[PDB]
């Protein structure tokens, strides 16, 4: 009976809402009223990584905070040495319809994929000098939106088929499938300790998943449009979202709700990317309007801007040592700022 179920779901939604409402005893702006604003944050362009020939769609820092890689519709997957600007590798892709990439913690692999619906793993230090695809991860029935390695043998993926998945790279098999999202999954982020991860989707919701158990613990609502980007807060008890509704939000896991919204009423274009600074004081967000905004994560004000791309900022990334923010753009350059 479709009636008795929608009627139950409705009542359970109201009951989740009232339980959440009776917990929201205070706002973050009250809690941080003693705290002073950060300075004007005025980061400078330290590097312009030149080489890609068309729109960059993604990028990811290596854990050493020096090597990064970037994926463009030009057909290339470039691993850069950000200190020098020298290209360490320029891997030609089989499918140029690329949408994500990932640098494995170990530095030994990168991953990449897009409208091919496949997450390709590339071996970086081989016997003899070549860089070759060591594994294709097929199974999704829609586009690969994001991917993140846990280690050399495990990678989590998100897709436009409405699911995420954990993969064993040796076997090429989906160990676990994460279902629940009712729209395309556009982004994901691993918790620091990699036992949980969060996903964001076109259903306007974010979900927290237990990797080992294979199930959704928590669904977070409030966004009015697609969640294009998502990032864990470094203590693991919170994350931030970027959406087409022009807002970033900060969600706390233990509260099971939104703590804060970051938006100006005169910014109405979509967010592409979000990243916390090392301490979490700053939330960086890229926009369709060509700029990054630097937000004070505590005070909800804009502290500064990274302005230096001639088309949209599509992706960004802060280093593990906190020394730098990388931007990637549709104008075909990446920039390193601090």
């Amino acid at each position: 009976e479709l009636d008795q179920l929608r009627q139950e779901a409705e009542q359970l939604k109201n009951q989740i809402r009232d339980a959440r409402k009776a917990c929201a005893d205070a706002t973050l702006s009250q809690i941080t009223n003693n705290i002073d604003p950060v300075g004007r944050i005025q980061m400078r362009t330290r590097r312009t990584l030149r080489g890609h020939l068309a729109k960059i769609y993604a990028m990811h820092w290596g854990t050493d905070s020096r090597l990064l890689l970037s994926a463009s519709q030009d057909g290339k997957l470039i691993i850069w040495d950000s200190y020098t600007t020298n290209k360490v590798h320029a891997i030609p892709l089989r499918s140029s319809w690329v949408m994500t990439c990932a640098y494995a913690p170990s530095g030994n692999y990168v991953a990449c994929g897009g409208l091919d619906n496949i997450c390709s793993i590339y071996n970086l230090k081989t016997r003899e000098g070549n860089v070759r695809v060591s594994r294709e991860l097929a199974g999704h029935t829609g586009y690969l939106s994001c991917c993140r390695f846990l280690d050399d043998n495990q990678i989590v993926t998100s897709s436009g088929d409405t699911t995420c998945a954990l993969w064993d790279i040796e076997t090429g098999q989906q160990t676990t499938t994460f279902t629940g999202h009712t729209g395309d999954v556009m982004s994901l982020s691993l918790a620091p300790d990699t036992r949980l991860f969060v996903s964001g989707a076109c259903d306007a919701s974010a979900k927290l998943w237990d990797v080992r158990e294979g199930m959704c613990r928590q669904t977070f609502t409030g966004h009015e449009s697609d969640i294009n980007a998502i990032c864990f807060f470094p203590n693991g008890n919170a994350f931030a979202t970027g959406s087409d509704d022009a807002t970033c939000r900060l969600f706390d896991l233990r509260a099971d709700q939104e703590l804060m919204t970051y938006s100006h009423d005169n910014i109405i274009c979509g967010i592409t990317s979000v990243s916390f600074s090392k301490s979490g004081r700053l939330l960086l967000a890229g926009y369709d309007d060509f700029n990054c905004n630097v937000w004070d994560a505590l005070k909800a004000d804009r502290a500064g801007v990274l302005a230096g791309h001639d088309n949209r900022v599509s992706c960004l990334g802060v280093t593990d040592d906190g020394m730098a923010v990388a931007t990637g753009s549709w104008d075909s350059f990446l920039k390193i700022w601090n």
Partner: nanobody
Amino acid sequence: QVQLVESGGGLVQAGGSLRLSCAASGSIFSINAMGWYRQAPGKQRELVAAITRGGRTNYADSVKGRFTLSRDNAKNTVYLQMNSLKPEDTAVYYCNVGRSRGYWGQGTQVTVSS
């Protein structure tokens, strides 16, 4: 190394018809859903017509029955047949695969005069 090429827009009299095409440089339409969006002068971009990988269509209420979205996988093309056009359909129409994380065409301007 990729091209999403739109064509078929222009100026048409109210009640007339336009056949927008969207031609991909590869076989992307055969393993993904796609979407046609539009953006009028100083409003937000909205979905207009979408097609799943298996061929189920879905339209915005303002166009339902007038706009039909079809697909020819063997030539990496989709078509948006737009019939009995009205002034409020005037906008830039975009071809898309992969939503906001994905691939867009440059935009085709559609102008409907009375």
